[PDB]
Amino acid sequence: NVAELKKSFNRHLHFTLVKDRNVATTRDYYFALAHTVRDHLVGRWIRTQQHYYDKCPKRVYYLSLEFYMGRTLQNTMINLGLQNACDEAIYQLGLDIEELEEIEEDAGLGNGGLGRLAACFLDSMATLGLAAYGYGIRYEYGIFNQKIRDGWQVEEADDWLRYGNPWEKSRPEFMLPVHFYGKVEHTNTGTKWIDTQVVLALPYDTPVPGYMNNTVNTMRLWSARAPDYIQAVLDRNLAENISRVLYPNDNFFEGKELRLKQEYFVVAATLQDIIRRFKASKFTVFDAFPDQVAIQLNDTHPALAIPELMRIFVDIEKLPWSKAWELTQKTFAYTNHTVLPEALERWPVDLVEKLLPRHLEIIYEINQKHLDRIVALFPKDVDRLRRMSLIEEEGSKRINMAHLCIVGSHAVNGVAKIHSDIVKTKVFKDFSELEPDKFQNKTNGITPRRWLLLCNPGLAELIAEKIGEDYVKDLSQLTKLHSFLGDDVFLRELAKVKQENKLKFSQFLETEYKVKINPSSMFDVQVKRIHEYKRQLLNCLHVITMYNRIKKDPKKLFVPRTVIIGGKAAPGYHMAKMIIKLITSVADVVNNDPMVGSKLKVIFLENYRVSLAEKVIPATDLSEQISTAGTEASGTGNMKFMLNGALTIGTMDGANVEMAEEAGEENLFIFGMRIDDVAALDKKGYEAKEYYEALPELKLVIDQIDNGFFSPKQPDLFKDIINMLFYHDRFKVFADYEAYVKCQDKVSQLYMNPKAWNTMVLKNIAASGKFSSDRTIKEYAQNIWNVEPSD
Amino acid sequence: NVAELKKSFNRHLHFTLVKDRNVATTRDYYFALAHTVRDHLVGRWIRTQQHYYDKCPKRVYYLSLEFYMGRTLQNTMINLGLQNACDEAIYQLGLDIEELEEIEEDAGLGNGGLGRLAACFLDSMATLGLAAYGYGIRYEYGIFNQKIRDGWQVEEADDWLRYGNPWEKSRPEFMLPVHFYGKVEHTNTGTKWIDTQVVLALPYDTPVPGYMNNTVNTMRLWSARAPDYIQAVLDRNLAENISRVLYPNDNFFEGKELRLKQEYFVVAATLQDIIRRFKASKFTVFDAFPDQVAIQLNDTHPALAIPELMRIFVDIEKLPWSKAWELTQKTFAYTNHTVLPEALERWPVDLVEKLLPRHLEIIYEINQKHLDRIVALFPKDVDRLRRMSLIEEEGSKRINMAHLCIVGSHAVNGVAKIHSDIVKTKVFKDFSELEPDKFQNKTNGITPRRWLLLCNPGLAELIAEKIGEDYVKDLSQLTKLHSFLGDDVFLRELAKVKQENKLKFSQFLETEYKVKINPSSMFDVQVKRIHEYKRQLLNCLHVITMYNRIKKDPKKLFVPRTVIIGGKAAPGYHMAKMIIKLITSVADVVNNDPMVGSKLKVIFLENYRVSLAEKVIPATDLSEQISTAGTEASGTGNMKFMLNGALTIGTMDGANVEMAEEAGEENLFIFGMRIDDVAALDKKGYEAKEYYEALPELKLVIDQIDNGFFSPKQPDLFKDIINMLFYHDRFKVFADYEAYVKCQDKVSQLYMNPKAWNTMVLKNIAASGKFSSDRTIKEYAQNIWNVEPSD
Ligand SMILES: COc1ccc(O)cc1NC(=O)NC(=O)c1ccc(F)cc1Cl
Ligand SMILES: COc1ccc(O)cc1NC(=O)NC(=O)c1ccc(F)cc1Cl
Ligand SMILES: *Cc1c(COP(=O)(O)O)cnc(C)c1O
Numbered sequence A, B: 001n002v003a004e005l006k007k008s009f010n011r012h013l014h015f016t017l018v019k020d021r022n023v024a025t026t027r028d029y030y031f032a033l034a035h036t037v038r039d040h041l042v043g044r045w046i047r048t049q050q051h052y053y054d055k056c057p058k059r060v061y062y063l064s065l066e067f068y069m070g071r072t073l074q075n076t077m078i079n080l081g082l083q084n085a086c087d088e089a090i091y092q093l094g095l096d097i098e099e100l101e102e103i104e105e106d107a108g109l110g111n112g113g114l115g116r117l118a119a120c121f122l123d124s125m126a127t128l129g130l131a132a133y134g135y136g137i138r139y140e141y142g143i144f145n146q147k148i149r150d151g152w153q154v155e156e157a158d159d160w161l162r163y164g165n166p167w168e169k170s171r172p173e174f175m176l177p178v179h180f181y182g183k184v185e186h187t188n189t190g191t192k193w194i195d196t197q198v199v200l201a202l203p204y205d206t207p208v209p210g211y212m213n214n215t216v217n218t219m220r221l222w223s224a225r226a227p228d229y230i231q232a233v234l235d236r237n238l239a240e241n242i243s244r245v246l247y248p249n250d251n252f253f254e255g256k257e258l259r260l261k262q263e264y265f266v267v268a269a270t271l272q273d274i275i276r277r278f279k280a281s282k283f284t285v286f287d288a289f290p291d292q293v294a295i296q297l298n299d300t301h302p303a304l305a306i307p308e309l310m311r312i313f314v315d316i317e318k319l320p321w322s323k324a325w326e327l328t329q330k331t332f333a334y335t336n337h338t339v340l341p342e343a344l345e346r347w348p349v350d351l352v353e354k355l356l357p358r359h360l361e362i363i364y365e366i367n368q369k370h371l372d373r374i375v376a377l378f379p380k381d382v383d384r385l386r387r388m389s390l391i392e393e394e395g396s397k398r399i400n401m402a403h404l405c406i407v408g409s410h411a412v413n414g415v416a417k418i419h420s421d422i423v424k425t426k427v428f429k430d431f432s433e434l435e436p437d438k439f440q441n442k443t444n445g446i447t448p449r450r451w452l453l454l455c456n457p458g459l460a461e462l463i464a465e466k467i468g469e470d471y472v473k474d475l476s477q478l479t480k481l482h483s484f485l486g487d488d489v490f491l492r493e494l495a496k497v498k499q500e501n502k503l504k505f506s507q508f509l510e511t512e513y514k515v516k517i518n519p520s521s522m523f524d525v526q527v528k529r530i531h532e533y534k535r536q537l538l539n540c541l542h543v544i545t546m547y548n549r550i551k552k553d554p555k556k557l558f559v560p561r562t563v564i565i566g567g568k569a570a571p572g573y574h575m576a577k578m579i580i581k582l583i584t585s586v587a588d589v590v591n592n593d594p595m596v597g598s599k600l601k602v603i604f605l606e607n608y609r610v611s612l613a614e615k616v617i618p619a620t621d622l623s624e625q626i627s628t629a630g631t632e633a634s635g636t637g638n639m640k641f642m643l644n645g646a647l648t649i650g651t652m653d654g655a656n657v658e659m660a661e662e663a664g665e666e667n668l669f670i671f672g673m674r675i676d677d678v679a680a681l682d683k684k685g686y687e688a689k690e691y692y693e694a695l696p697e698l699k700l701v702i703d704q705i706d707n708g709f710f711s712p713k714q715p716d717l718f719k720d721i722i723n724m725l726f727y728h729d730r731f732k733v734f735a736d737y738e739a740y741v742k743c744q745d746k747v748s749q750l751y752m753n754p755k756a757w758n759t760m761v762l763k764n765i766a767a768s769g770k771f772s773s774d775r776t777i778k779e780y781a782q783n784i785w786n787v788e789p790s791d
C-alpha cells in the first residue's frame, strides 16, 4: 500500500542516506525510492532462485558482452505493479517523481540493437517464467556520453557507477579465478596449462522482474580484480582494465588484445559458475548437463565458450574427447547478427597463441576432426576444405569465430526471415548442406513493457480503454483494434496521444538546441548508430533536396517537417564522424535561413541511448529504416516505432519485410532496390556518376556539398564523403536516391489527410503483435533451448 | 534490547543481503550485524552535525595523511553501550559474535604511531563532545598485508574495500575540484592559476561515536576521481592513482612525486570544504575565521595547507596579504613527531615549481617576510639567515616543510616532555628564541575505550567492580586502585585476568604457528614497526644470549619465556628486512632444539596491525620499549602495555620517562644510557669493537651470527648486519647490551615471585591515568584550539 511505501522511503532516507528533509538532495530522494522498490522484490527474488534449486528445471544462460539495460526504476515499478502506489507515495511527500527518475544513470552496457536485444530478452524470459540468467561484464564505463562541439562528435566517459548502483548486489562467495597467458606442457599426466597470470572475477547480481508474475530472474555481471612496491600496487590497474570499458564498436571488428581478454574473461567466469551450479544441484556425471543447461551465444563475441567448455571437460574433468564434444554441441546455440565482412570476428592465431595457448590447441583439434569428416564425404573437392576450415591460411592466419560457433553448436539462428535465409543458403552454404536441421530463424522482438507501457503511457491507456488490458501478456490481441477502423472518434484520440508526446518532446528540443519547433510539423526521425550501411547519408541528401525545393519556389505548398537524425559513431570510424559533421552543417544552414523558417527544421539528437529512445520514439510520425537491401540483419528500432504510432519509410530489408507482411505492404512506405536488384547491380558493376549526371536533383545536392555551400570556411571538408560516394560506395546511396525522394513525396501527401494517415497508423499498431519479444522467446524456448514457459 | 536487535539483524539479512539462513555466509552475517549497529548511530549522527550548524561552536579539523583506525564493529558497539545486547542477540540466533567480527577488514590507513594517534584522538574528541572532524585520504589500499615466506617479509596488497565498507557513506554534493600543474599569470584582476590538470575529490564520511554520550562526529576521507578512445578511458587511472595506496614509510622521507600529489590533494579538498562550511554558516567576512576554525597539522605531511589557505584568501577571496597571513597563523597549529634527519620532509623546488607553481610563489613570499624580520632583529648574523630560511640552498634547492609549518602556525608541539624540549631548545632553537610562547608540549595518549574496554574486557570489568566505571571518561581515577596494594585476593584476580588473556592468545599462536606454547612462561613482547632506532636487533641479541645459557648449562634454573617480536618493515628498507630474517632464523633454531624445549620459544608475529595489537597487548607480561635515548619521540605502544597489566623494560626515551615519573622509577625496568650519556659517546667517538672484546657473551652471539650458526646454507647472509653493527651504527646497540642483559636478569628474578610482580603491575595500572588521550585532547583544547568540552 501507499502508507507503507512512504514509511519505507522515510526509513531509507534516514538510515541508508543519513538525511532529513531539510538537507536531502534530489539524488538522495532517488536512492531512497530505488532502495524501497528493490526491497519489494527481495521476497520474490529469493523464492524464484530457491524454486530453481528445488525443482531443477532446464536453465537458459544468455551469454553476452552487451546488456543495454537503460534505467531500471520505472521498469521495476511497472513490472511489480507498484507504479501507481509509488507515484502516490512520492506525491504525498511533496516530491516530483519525474525529477527523481531523471537522476538515474542508464546502464548503457551496450552498443545498439545487439545489446538491446539481450535486455528485451531478459524481460521476456522473466515474464514467461523461464529459468533464465543473463551473463555479462560489469563495465565501469558503458557506451560513451556523446556531445556535439563545433558540429563534431566528442566522447566523454560514461561514469555510470560514480555515485553507486542501488540495483546490483555483489556476490563475494562466488568469486572465481580466470587464467591468461602462460604455456602448454605435454606431460605423462596429460595436457596442462601452466605459468599463467590470474585475474579474479567478482560477480554482481541485478534483479530482472517479470511482468506481473512471481518471477524475478538474475543478470550476473562480472568485474575484474587483481589477485618498486608502489608501482606493483598501481599495476593492479592492468588486471582491472579488463572490465573497465565497453568497446564502442557496432557492426565492426576491431582486433585488440584487450577485447580478446574481455571475451575470455566473461566466458571462463560464466562457464565455471554454470558447472559449479550444475554440480551443486540434484542433477559420466555430465551426461545430464545439456538436459539441465542451454547456453546461448549472442554473436561470436563469446565464441571462446566452446573450446573453454571442452578445456574444462577434457583437461579438468578428464572426460574423453568424443563424449565431451557431444555434450558441448548439445549445450551451445549461436545467434548470428550480421553478414557484413568487416563485422565478422577473425582473431589472429598469434594473438590467441600468446593469450590462450591451450584454447588454440583445442580449436586446431576441433578443426582437424571437422576437416577429416569433410574429406570422408567429399574427397575430390579441395576448395571446400579451406572454405569450411576454422582457420583462414591466407597471408596472416586468422581464426574464423563464426565457423567455430557453427561446429560447436546444435542450432544456429539468424534474426529475421530474409537474414536467416542469407546465413543458411549463402554465407554458410557449405555448413547448411551437411546439417540441414541446424540452421533456423528467430525473428527479433522488443518488450512491450519498456517499449509501450513505460515509454508511452498515453497510447497504452488508449489501447486499454478500447480493447482491454489483456494485450500486455499476449500482444497479438492488438489485432482487436481493427474494430475501430471507420471510427473518427478513435482516430482523433490516436492523434491527440501523438500530439501530447510531440509537445512534451518539443519542450526538450527547445531547451537543448536553439530552434523553434513547428507543433504542426511531421516528426521525421532516424535514430540508430551511425553507419554507411544504415544510410543516414541518404537521409541527409533528401533534407538538402527539400531545402533546394523551398528556395526555388518559396510560396509553394510544403508539408512542414522536423527531421531528427541521431546516433553515436564509433570513435575510430572516420566516415561516420564525417556524416555527423555533414548533418550538423546542413542543420545550421536550414535552421538559420529566413526563407525556409517553420517549413523545415533539422536536429541532430545528441547522446542517443535507451532513456532518450523512450522519449523520441512515442513522439515520432515517420520512421526512417533506409538500410541497403541485405545489410540490416533485422533492426529493432523499426518495431519500436511501429508499436508507438509511427509510419515506416524503408527498404525491403531485415524485419521491415516482416512488418510489411503483417500490416500489409501498402501500409508501409517501401521503396528502392530489393535483394535481387542489389545483386544485379554488383554483377554489372556500380557506376555512381551515372545517377549524378542523369538526375539533376542529385547533381545540385552533391555540388553544394563539394563546392562548400554547407562549409564556407572549409570548402574541401567533405571531400572524403564525395570520394566514397563516387568510387567506393558499397552501399549504393545514389542508386536508391530517386525512389527515396518519390516515396518521401507520397509520405508528405498522406500527412495532409489526418484521417488517412491515422487509419494507416491504426493498421500498423494493430499488426505489431508479432514483434513482441515474448513471441521471439517462446520460439527460442520451443525449438532451441527445449524449455517450457511456466506460470 | 535483545529481541529488537535480533529482528533488525534478520531484516538486514533479508533486505540488505538478499539471504535466508540456508545460504547466508559468515560475511553476510557480519554485514547484517554491522548495518544493525550503524542504524543505532544515525539519529545521533544527524543531530550532532545539525547541532554544529545551528549553534556554530569553534570547529577542530584534524588534518592527517594517516588514520590507523583498525576495525569499527566492536568499538561502535562498546561506545553505544550495545555490546552485551548484541552478543546475546547473536548467540540466540545460533552464531558466534567473535567469528563475525573477524570478517571485518582493518582500516589500516596508517603506518604506526602517527596514524594511531589520529585515531585515538578522534575517539577522544567525540567522547569529550568537541566539534571535531578528521580529514584524510580514503586509500584504496592501506598498509600492506605482511606475509613471511622462507623467513623473509613479503608484501601483499591490502584490498580492504573489495567487499565494501558498511561504515562509510559517499557525499556526492560535496565533490570538489583539485588543481595540478599549469602556469601563473599576474593580471590586473589578481593572480590566476590557469591551464591546470583537474582531479576530482569525492568525500566519504565515517561515524566517530563518542563513548556513552550523544555525540557522533565525522571522519571525512577523500577519494580521487577523474573529471585512441580506449586508452583515454584507461588513462583515467592516472588521476585515480592519487588515492590508490598509502606510502608505507614510517619515520622516513621518500621524495616521490605521487606522495606530493597526495599531500596537496588532501589539503586542497579539505581547505575548500572548510571554507564552504564557514561561508554557509550563520555567521570582508573572514575576520571570525580563526575563532570558528582550528586546523591541526599532523606532522609536516599537510604543510601545504599554509600556502593553500593563503592562496584561497588572496587569489579567490581577494583579501590583502597582511590580513590573510594574520588569519592563517591563528588558524594553524603544528605537531612535530620526528627526531631523525632522514624523517624530515625536504621537497625539491623544481618538483614543487612544476606541480604547484602558485604555492612556490607564496612559499617564497612567506620566506621573504620571514627573512626581512631576522635582518631587522639580527643584522650581523648571516648564518642565522640560511639556518632559518624555508629554502635550503645546499646543492639542489629544497623546501624545509618543518620551517614552513612553524612560521605559518601559532602553536608548535612535541609529543613528550623530553621530545618537546629538544624541538624547542635544540632542533628549532632559532625559532623559539624569537617566539617562546609558540612552542609547547602535548604528551601523547591512547584511548581507554579501544585500548582497555575493547581489547581487555576482563581487566576493564575487574577495575569497574572495585572503583566504578567513572575511570573510562577520566582515567586519572585509576589512582584509587592504590588502596588495593595489600589486597591479596585482588592481586590473584588481577593475575587470573592476565592468565585468561594469555590462554586465549596462546590458542591464536598455536593455530597460526606450528609451535607449542608453555602457559606458565613470561610473555616477552616487542611489537612496533621494524627500525634500527627501535632496536629489535638488541632484543634478538638477548634471545641468543638466553639460548646459549640453556645450552651451556641445561640443569640450571631458567625462568621460561615466550619472546614475541612483531612489526612491518618498509619495502625499500633493506636493514629492517635483514633484521626480520635474523629473528626468524633465530626462531627456527631455538624452537626446534630438544635441549631447550619449553624453556624458550620465539615467534615473529606476522602482519602486526591494530586488530592484532588488541589481541597481543592484553596477553603481555613484559613490554620491550628499548629505543636508543633521544630517538623515540614519545611512543604509544608503551602506554597500551602499561594500561593492560604488563611491566616495562626500557630506556629513558620518549614517554617512558613520564611512565617512570607516574609509576615510580623502581616500578619500571629502566636501563642503559640516558640523553646526556649518548651525547658524551658521540663526542668521544663510538667504537663498537671495544664492547665486543670486553663482553664474552656478546662475543659468542656475534660470532654465531657472522659464522652462519643461524644460516648454515648461507654463512655470509647476515654480513650487512655485522658491518652495520661494527662500523655504521648510529643507534649504539653494543653500548646498551650489558645493561640490557643485566636488567633482563632482574625481570626474570621478579617473575619467580608472583606477589612482587603483581604488586608492581598494580602500581603501573594505577598510574597509567595520565596516558589517556582524553587528557591529551583536553590540553590541546585548552592551550591550542581554544575549544571547550561539552555533553
Ligand atoms: C549539517 O547537517 C545537517 C544540518 C541540518 C539538518 O536538518 C540535517 C543535517 N544533516 C543530515 O541530515 N545528515 C548529515 O549531516 C549526514 C549525511 C550523510 C552522512 F554520511 C552523515 C551525516 Cl551526519
Ligand atoms: C540458490 O538460491 C537459494 C536457494 C535456497 C535458499 O534457501 C536461498 C537461496 N537464495 C537466497 O537466499 N538468496 C539468493 O539467492 C540471492 C542472494 C543475493 C542476491 F543478490 C540475489 C539473490 Cl536471488
Ligand atoms: C532499439 C535501439 C537500437 C537499435 O536500433 P536499430 O534502428 O534497430 O539499429 C539502438 N540503440 C538504442 C538506444 C535502441 O533503443
Ligand SMILES: *Cc1c(COP(=O)(O)O)cnc(C)c1O
Binding pocket: B111, B112, B113, B116, B527, B528, B529, B608, B609, B610, B613, B634, B635, B636, B637, B638, B640
Ligand atoms: C600502538 C601501535 C603502534 C605504535 O607503537 P610504538 O611501540 O609506540 O611504536 C604501531 N602500530 C600499531 C598497530 C599500534 O597499535
Ligand SMILES: OC[C@H]1O[C@H](O)[C@H](O)[C@@H](O)[C@@H]1O
Binding pocket: A112, A113, A114, A117, A251, A337, A338, A415, A444, A632, A633, A634, A635, A636, A654
Ligand atoms: O539482432 C539484434 C540486432 O543486432 C545488430 O545490431 C544488427 O545490426 C541488427 O540488425 C539486429 O536487429
Ligand SMILES: OC[C@H]1O[C@H](O)[C@H](O)[C@@H](O)[C@@H]1O
Binding pocket: B112, B113, B114, B117, B251, B337, B338, B415, B444, B632, B633, B634, B635, B636, B654
Ligand atoms: O606522536 C605519535 C608517534 O609519532 C611517530 O610515530 C613517532 O615515531 C612516535 O614516537 C610517536 O609516538
